[PDB]
Amino acid sequence: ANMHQLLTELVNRGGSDLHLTTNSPPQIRIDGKLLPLDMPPLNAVDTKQLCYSILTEQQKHKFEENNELDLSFGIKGLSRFRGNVFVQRGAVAGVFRVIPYKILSFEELGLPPVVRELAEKPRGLVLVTGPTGSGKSTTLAAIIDKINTDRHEHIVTVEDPIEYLHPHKSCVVNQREVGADTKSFKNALKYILRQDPDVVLVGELRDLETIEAALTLAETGHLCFATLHTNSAVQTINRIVDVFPSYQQPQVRAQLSFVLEGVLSQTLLPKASGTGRVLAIEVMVPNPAIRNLIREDKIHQIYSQMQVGQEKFGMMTMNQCLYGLLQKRHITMDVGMGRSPDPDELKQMLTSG
Amino acid sequence: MANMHQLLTELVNRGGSDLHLTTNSPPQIRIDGKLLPLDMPPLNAVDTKQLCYSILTEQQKHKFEENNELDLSFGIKGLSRFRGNVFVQRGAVAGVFRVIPYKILSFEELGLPPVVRELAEKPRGLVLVTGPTGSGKSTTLAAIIDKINTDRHEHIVTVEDPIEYLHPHKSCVVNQREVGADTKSFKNALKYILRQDPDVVLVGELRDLETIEAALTLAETGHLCFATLHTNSAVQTINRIVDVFPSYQQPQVRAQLSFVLEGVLSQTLLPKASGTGRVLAIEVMVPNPAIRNLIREDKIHQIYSQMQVGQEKFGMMTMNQCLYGLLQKRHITMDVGMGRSPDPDELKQMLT
Amino acid sequence: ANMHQLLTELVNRGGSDLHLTTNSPPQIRIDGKLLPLDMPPLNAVDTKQLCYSILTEQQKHKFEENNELDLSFGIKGLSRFRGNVFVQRGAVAGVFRVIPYKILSFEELGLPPVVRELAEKPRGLVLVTGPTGSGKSTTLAAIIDKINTDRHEHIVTVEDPIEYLHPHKSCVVNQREVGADTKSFKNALKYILRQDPDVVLVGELRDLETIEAALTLAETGHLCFATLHTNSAVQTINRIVDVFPSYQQPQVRAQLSFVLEGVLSQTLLPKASGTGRVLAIEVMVPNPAIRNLIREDKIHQIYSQMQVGQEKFGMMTMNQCLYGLLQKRHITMDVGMGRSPDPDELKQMLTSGVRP
């Protein structure tokens, strides 16, 4: 009934987010969907006492000045949390995310064995892309945890915001949160070469400066991880090249062909059973043929190379993953078709074999 | 301050559309389109300020005094909600107040085609409801937001200036932020929206360059974004969005739009042929793979031809095709249907 | 007060403007031309004394901070006035414009009956154009007053500045003065749709933003009035189109062809008697043929349709109006010819075997 009990239940019930707003009971997001708790609806007095109970006095003043506040806090013996407090219809409202210290393993996440091998790469650019909540941070956290476990190197992450904490194991891990630890991605990236890193996570490739920063890191002997909100390997490569002026795109294509070591495009789909989510992932691992196609500006022909790189490189097109999920009845036909980038291709391959 | 409450009660009881308060005239109510003065003495400058200020918050009174303009909404328990505009004329306060029903109308009550219901089922993307002021945009948006609220277990956040339709929680969590009270501005609300775990976001009118980039970012990162524009057609809407950006960034914006656009609705309310009420005429564009290439290929005007043949497959409909059907079914007069066609000669060919 | 007496003489003598400046007697503008009053020339002491006699303490302080001041004021039993005070050659100077409360009728203004029929339009765009002091606000005030009399609708005006005041009749009339009631045309037009209007006066079509606002008003079921400074219907339509980029001119021409309901272009000419001025006006009322010519980018061919549209559509070219002013001997031959856009056509009209 208080903030401590709600946050403990959020962790205990495997929720990702707790929502507190007027005229609704506390609600928790489990596997992406909100489920209300068996409690009376809150009023404006309730949402204010609950949200204020986890703020410092200085934080309460800054929220009252702007009607907005981002913060993080810890509950001893429980978990860390990300909070956002705001105002709607004249009342306090809040959303609170658990940030787990412990990452589940690759097999628990449904990630193919090639993801474990990407975590062993000495150098290059590895891109994990997809929409919000498609599993990107969990894959990145699993990869970084394997690196942390296996290497004696320096890992620096720049995140907006940090979604997983990595205690030091064999690596030295420094994590900078945008907006608190560092002013911006640009400022962190301006000094990242002066911090003796070996592995760097740069977050979303939001602008040209960040793309150039990720390419330089990957060219100078570092393992660079970044995200995009693209849905396929080809769409990912096109977005990176096409954001640059036409005159500088030849160099970017040449740069990408040398340093790119893997592209993972994930999506979480509803299970046909109606409970839980299943991972759909497109995997592109560059071979000499794909690297030439990038340099030759034959980006779209990379898809044909992914269709035949399953046994050799662990590649898998998005349609090839949906096909396997369909034969095992993990997703319905309606969900698979609404997600296929080419439903006619997936339809024809289902009829044969 | 209790006189204003009684005037609005009289406005509701007499079936009026709008209440007018201005100096040197009695309160006037629009009934069936025509103004009628109430049998009361005329107001002075003190009165129009006193009545209008009685329904303002202290901030709203300081916001109004800073700009000599103010839009707002408020509710009267047991009566109705109302949208108000207060302004200044000849050195005195004036006000107009419209009626906002508590009960949100259905798709069929609003005259919205079944394709709007399928747009309400989209999991992510950008859906634009456009038109000039009072073209039914908030009513259409509320119907869309009410269907998602009814059907989904997701988090809906709206940013409104002001909040018009209220959406009680159903199966969704719905948070509605009013600019100038709950949040300082659209810019400030959008700065924090990514930390609030939203699934569906209403950002209001695409009023400037900065909000459009924010709306494209929300829709690109896996969210369903609703926004409005002032344009009157799908093609005019797409051109307006791209052309506000500097020439060097327009290639990316067209590329983003080809990926993220999920629907364009351009509405307009016309008087009914019976002489009572207004009926919705709507142009609906839902991008298919063909339209997405036309967007990427910068052949935006050829999109109109695609809408003419996408009715059965995709539920598409040009404005002229909608006006033709409303005219044949006797919902509108010939002058109103002709007075709205963007190409009156095309509608003639369909008439034959 | 001498100032009280000067303003009474200005009103009584039908002057439009009173001028007070150093080394000249007070001068009043009568029929567009300045005429000095039979008084000794004023000095700097006089001009500061006369202008300060009508200022509040707050106005005197603001004028002294900038050497500029706009204001309006009323004189009980006389008239209201719009004033401007400034400084020149180290001395105070002032100009004062009268704002009449009473609007003259259409026939008094010399406006043809077709203008009255334009006031009965339920929707569309009606443009009243001409140079400064060509009677535009006066024509607009007569139209607004007829609408106010005949309709139960909401009239909103946005003006820079307000020229005629309209007491309520059957309409509710709200008049917003730029720089006092509202910050700008842009802000008034930003909220005008939320103000439940039926008839809107938007002032000068100064930029694309205002033209786009008027087109939106005219398309959504409103009657919109606006002004330009063009001298003919064809010149008026082209001026509106040519303000847009070349790629967007097709749409603007298409919009105008749909919503345009009337174009009036005026000029005030001296009378043959030497007293008063007579209105010369060109009237274009769009028919289906003219609307097509607009859409087809055949604007110059619109004039030929106007030459034959008096009886059918109530149209009237400038030359046809000048012809009528010449037959009634209201203007001299030189004045009529000096304004004709085509003197040879007007000559042909005068040398007619069907002349009567």
Task: Walk me through the structure.
This is part of a larger assembly, with chains A (about 350 residues), B (about 350 residues) and C (about 350 residues). Helix content of chain A is about 40%, strand content about 25%. Chain A has about 350 residues and is of the alpha/beta class. Chain A has two domains: about 1-100, 2-Layer Sandwich (Beta-Lactamase); about 105-355, P-loop containing nucleotide triphosphate hydrolases (Rossmann fold), CATH 3.40.50.300. In chain A, β10, α8 (about 210-220) and β11 (about 225-230) form a beta-alpha-beta unit. Chain A is globular. The termini of chain A are far apart. Chain B has about 350 residues and is α/β, with parallel strands linked by helices. Helix content of chain B is about 40%, strand content about 25%. Chain B is built from 15 helices and 13 strands. By secondary structure, chain C is α/β, with parallel strands linked by helices. Chain C folds into two domains: about 1-100, Beta-Lactamase (2-Layer Sandwich), CATH 3.30.450.90; about 105-355, 3-Layer(aba) Sandwich (Rossmann fold), CATH 3.40.50.300. Chain C has 16 helices and 13 strands. The longest helix of chain C has 15 residues, at about 135-150. Classes of the chains: A alpha/beta (about 350), B alpha/beta (about 350), C alpha/beta (about 350). The interface between B and C is medium-sized, with 37 and 31 residues. It is classed as motor protein.
Features:
part of a larger assembly, 3 chains, A: 353 residues, alpha/beta, Beta-Lactamase, Rossmann fold, 7-stranded mixed beta sheet, 6-stranded antiparallel beta sheet, globular, B: 352 residues
Chain pair with largest interface: B-C, 37 and 31 residues
CATH class of the largest domain in chain B: Alpha Beta
- In terms of structural class, how would the helical and strand content of chain B be classed? alpha/beta
The ordered H/E elements of chain A are HEEEHHEEEHHEHEEHEHEHHEEHHHHHH
Number of helices of chain A: 16
As for the CATH topology of the largest domain in chain A, it is: Rossmann fold
What does the overall shape of chain B look like? Answer: globular
- Largest sheet composition of chain A: 7 strands, mixed
Protein name (chain C): Twitching motility pilus retraction ATPase
InterPro entries (chain C): P-loop_NTPase, PilT/PilU, T2SS/T4SS_dom, T4SS_GSP_E_ATPase
Family (chain C): Belongs to the GSP E family.
Organism (chain C): Geobacter metallireducens (strain ATCC 53774 / DSM 7210 / GS-15)
